[PDB]
Design a protein around this ligand. Sequence first.
Ligand SMILES: CC(=O)N1CCN(c2cccc(-c3cc(-c4ccnn4C4CCOCC4)c4c(N)ncnn34)c2)CC1
Lengths: 163, 911
Amino acid sequence: VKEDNIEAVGKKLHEYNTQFQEKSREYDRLYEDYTRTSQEIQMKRTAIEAFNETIKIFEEQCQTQERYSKEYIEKFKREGNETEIQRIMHNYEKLKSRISEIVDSRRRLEEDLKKQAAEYREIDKRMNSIKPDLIQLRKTRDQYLMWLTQKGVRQKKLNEWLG
Amino acid sequence: NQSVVVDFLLPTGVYLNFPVSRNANLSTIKQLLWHRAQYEPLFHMLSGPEAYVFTCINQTAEQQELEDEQRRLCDVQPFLPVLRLVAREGDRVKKLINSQISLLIGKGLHEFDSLCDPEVNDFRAKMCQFCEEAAARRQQLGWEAWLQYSFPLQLEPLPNRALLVNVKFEGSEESFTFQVSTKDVPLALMACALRKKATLQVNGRHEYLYGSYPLCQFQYICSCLHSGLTPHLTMVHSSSILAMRDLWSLEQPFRIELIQGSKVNADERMKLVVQAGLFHGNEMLCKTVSSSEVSVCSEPVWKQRLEFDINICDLPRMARLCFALYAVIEKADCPIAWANLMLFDYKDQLKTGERCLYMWPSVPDEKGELLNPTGTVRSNPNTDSAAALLICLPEVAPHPVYYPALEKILELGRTEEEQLQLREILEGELYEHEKDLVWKLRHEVQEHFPEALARLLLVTKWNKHEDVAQMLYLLCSWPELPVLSALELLDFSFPDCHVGSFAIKSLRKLTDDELFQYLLQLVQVLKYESYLDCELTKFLLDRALANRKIGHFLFWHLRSEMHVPSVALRFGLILEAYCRGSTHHMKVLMKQGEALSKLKALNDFVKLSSQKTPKPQTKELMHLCMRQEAYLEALSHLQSPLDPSTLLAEVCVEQCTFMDSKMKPLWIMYSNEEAGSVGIIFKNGDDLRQDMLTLQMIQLMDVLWKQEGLDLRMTPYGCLPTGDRTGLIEVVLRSDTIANIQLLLNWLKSKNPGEALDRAIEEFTLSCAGYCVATYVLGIGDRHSDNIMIRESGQLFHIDFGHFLGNFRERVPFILTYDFVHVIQQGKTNNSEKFERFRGYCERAYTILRRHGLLFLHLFALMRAAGLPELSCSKDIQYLKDSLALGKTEEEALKHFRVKFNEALRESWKT
Ligand SMILES: CC(=O)N1CCN(c2cccc(-c3cc(-c4ccnn4C4CCOCC4)c4c(N)ncnn34)c2)CC1
C-alpha cells in the first residue's frame, strides 16, 4: 500500500479494481479465442484424416482398376474391340484426374491448419503476457481491501469503491 | 442447392460421377447408379444391386458401411460426396454397431486405436465384453425382468379413497371403466378387469403398472388423483412385451531427468522455471523441488536432475508427479502450463524411461498455487499445438518393479485420558498435534468410531510405506459404512484405490431411485479418477445395464461433455461400452441425437433470421424449414430425452415458436392422438449444468420432504444438457410469469372458480414455502417476478437460475414477497390462521433439510469436479453449513430461522 490516508487509499482501491475488472475481461475474451481455436484445430486435423482416408480408397480403386483391367484389355484386343479398351482407359484417366482434385483440396486444408496453428500459438503468447499483469492487479486490489478492513472501514464504503 | 455431384467407385475399377438430390435415400441412389452404370464399361460383370453396399468416409474420418439404405444422403453426411460399392456379406453385425457408436458418442472409435496405449485397449477388451455378456444375459431372462429393465417403476416417495379407473386392450377401441380402492395392488386391478372382460401400461406413455405396490403409490395415479382426471390404461400380457424385447528394498531417493520443453510461447525478456512436487490427493509427499532459470524460447533445454526428499520404497500407489512451467523475470510470476503423471502405471509397474507430457494451460484463480495436483493425470489431446515437457524416469533394477500385492501389503501391516481426548477431536480440520493422536489410537477409531474412517485416512502419513500398510490393513477389516459416509470417500482427498473400492462396496446398497438422485455427482467424480478401469466405472456401467432410465441419463451425462478435452477419452470409452450392452436403447438415443442435431441447425437459422426480419416473419420462415421431410421425420416420433417414458409423437408446427431472450430458445410443441400436449425447449448458447444441479437439489428436497409426509406441491421440470452450451428444458403447460400476470388473485379467480379457489390458495401456500426455503438454502439471489412462475392450478415455481450460493459471495436473505403473503392470506390484511400455517410449512421444510444437511455438503463437495465457477472451493460448500445452520443445535437453528423469517416479513412491508 503506497499511500496512508483512508479516502486516498479508497480511490486507489476503486482504480485498481476497475483496472482488474478490465484486464480480467480481456483475458476471458482471449481464453474464449484459445478454446475456440483449440476446437477448430482438432476439426481441421480430423478433416485432414478424412481426406487421407478418401485418397486411400481412391488409391485402392486404381489398384483394383489395374489388376481387373489386365484380364479384359487382353480379351477385347483379340476380338478387335479396341473401342472397349479405349473406354476402360479413358474412364481410368477420369478417375486419376479426380484424385488430383481431392489431393489439392487436402493441400488447401494443410495451409489453413498451419496458419491457424500459428494463430493459436500467438493467442497463447498474448495470454501468457497478460497473466503476470492480471495476477498483480488481483494481489494489489486485495492488499488495499485488507488495509481498509484493518483500518476499520465500513462495508458500505468498501462496496462503494469496488462496485 | 438441392442437388450434389457424387463420385461412384465400382468394384471393377470403373469411376462414375453424376448429380443426385441431397435429400435422396441410398436405396434410390443405388438405382440411379445402376441406370447410368449400364452405359459405362464392364457392367456385364457386376452382380445385382442388392449384392452390394455403399461405403463412405463419414464426418469422424472413419469408413462406414451404409446398410440402412433408407437413410438420406444428408442424414448420412459423408465427408466428401464419394461412395464405393463393396461386397455386402462379411459379418455386418459388428460393422453396423461399431459405426453407429462413433456417430452416437461424437468421437470415432479409430481415435482410440490411434493412441497405441495398452490401457485404452485393455479397457475396451474388458468393458465391451462384460457389457456384451450382461446384454446377452438380459435377453435370456423372463418377461417380468426385462419389463423392470426397460420400464422401471416410477413410484412416489395416507388415506384410502375411491378411484374411478379406465381400462382397454391393444387394437380394441372399446373401454371398460370400473372403480377400485386407492390402496389396491395392480394384481387385483387387472383381476377385477379380467372378470369384467368376459361379461399394466399407461397409453401414450412407456410407463407400466406392476409389482407388489398400491395403485396410489404410482406417479400416474398420484397425478390423476390431484388433477382430478381418470387413469386410462391398456391391459397387455407376455405376447406384446416379447415383441418389444425382440520393491520395498529400493531405499534410494526419487529422481527425475528434466530434459526438454517444446512449443513454449512467452515473452522473450523472461526466464523459464519448472516446479515439480509429489502428491497423493491434495497432500504433498515431499518438498517442491524447482529447476534452473533458462532463456525464453519455443524449445528450452534443462538436462537437469531433480531429486525429491522421499526414498522410492516410500512412494504410495497413487503417487502423482505434478509439473508447472513458470515464466519468471530473471532475478508477479506467470504460470504457463501444468501436467500431472502417475508414478505407477495401470498394471502396477513403476514407470521407467522417457515420457513426453503434453501440458495443459494454467488459469489464474484465487489460489494461485504453483502446482495443480487435482488436474487430469492424462495428456493434452491437442498434440498438434500444445506445449510439452520431455522428462525421463531412471532405471532402478534389471527387472521391472510392481507395487506390492494385497497379500504382501496386509503382511507388513499386521490409555483412558487420551480416549476422552479422541472423543473431543472427532467432534473439519485436524492440526499436527491432533493428527499424531488420532493415528496412535487408530485401532480405537476402527473400534469406537467406524464413521470417522475419513478423518483417519487423512491423518495417515502416505509418504511412509510403513504407515500406509497399517492403514490399508485396517481398511480390509473396516465395518461397512452407510451410503452417506461412502459419498464423502469419493472425493479427490481419498485417492487410494482400496478406499474407492470400500466406498463402492457401500454404494452397492443403493436403490435405483436413490442412485438416480446422485447420478450427476457420481459421473463428475470420474474426473478425479487416475486409471480408465476403476470400480466406479464398473459400478456405473453395471447399474446402467440393469436399468434403462439410469442408462439413459448416464448416456446424456457423459455425451454432453464429449467436447471437454480432459474427459473426451474417458467418457468416450464408457459410452462405447454402454452402447455394446444396450443395442435396443442405442436405437432410441440415435432418434434423439438426430432431432437434437436438426434443432441446433434450426436454432442457428432462427438466430441469424432474427437479426434481419421481425418475429412473425422468422416464425413462418422457421416453420417452412421444419415442414421439410428430412426435418419433420427427425423431429417427429421419438422418446423424450428429458424423460424417456414420454413419447414425443406429432410436431405441432403451428404451435412451434422461439423465445425473445439472450440466446433465442426454440419452443417445440407435441400432440399425441394415443395419450397430454407435451412441450420441450431447445436452448443453445449458455451452459445448462448449473440449472440442472439447482433443479436436482430442489427435487432431492421435494423427495426428502415427501418422505416426512410433507408434500409442498413443487414443480421439478426437466432440464438436460445434451452438449456444448446445448440442452433441453421441459415445458410446464398452463403457466406464466408473475410479471406477465401483473399486466394475481384475479388470475387465480379466472382459473379456479368456486370451491377450486381454496384448492389453488393451498397449492400456492405449499409451493411458496418450499421455493422460499429452497432459494434461501441454495443462496439463489436475483428472484423477481420475471423468473417466478405460477401454474393455473395455483402452484408457484422458480425458473432460470444463474447465480448459485450467493455469487451474484454475499449472504442471500430469506425472502417473503408482499404479493405472495397477500395471496396466502386469501386477500385479508390479517389472517393469523392461514399465515401461521404457512410459517409452519417453512419451519418444517427447513428442519427436514437440516436433518439431511451432510447429504447436501457431500453432494456439493463432489460437484466441485464439474468446474462450475460458483462451486469451486470449500467456501461455496461453507455457504450451505451457514444457510442450514449445521454448526448449531436444532432449537438454536429454528430460533435464528424464525428471526430471519420475521425480518423477511418486516422488510416485505418496506417495498
Ligand atoms: C405459448 C407460447 O408460445 N408462449 C407463452 C409462454 N411464454 C413464456 C413466457 C415467459 C417464460 C416462459 C418460460 C420459461 C421457462 C423456463 C424454465 C426454465 N428455463 N426456462 C426458459 C428456457 C429458455 O430460456 C429462457 C428460460 C418455462 C417453462 N419451463 N415452461 C413454460 N414456460 N416457460 C414462457 C412463451 C410464449
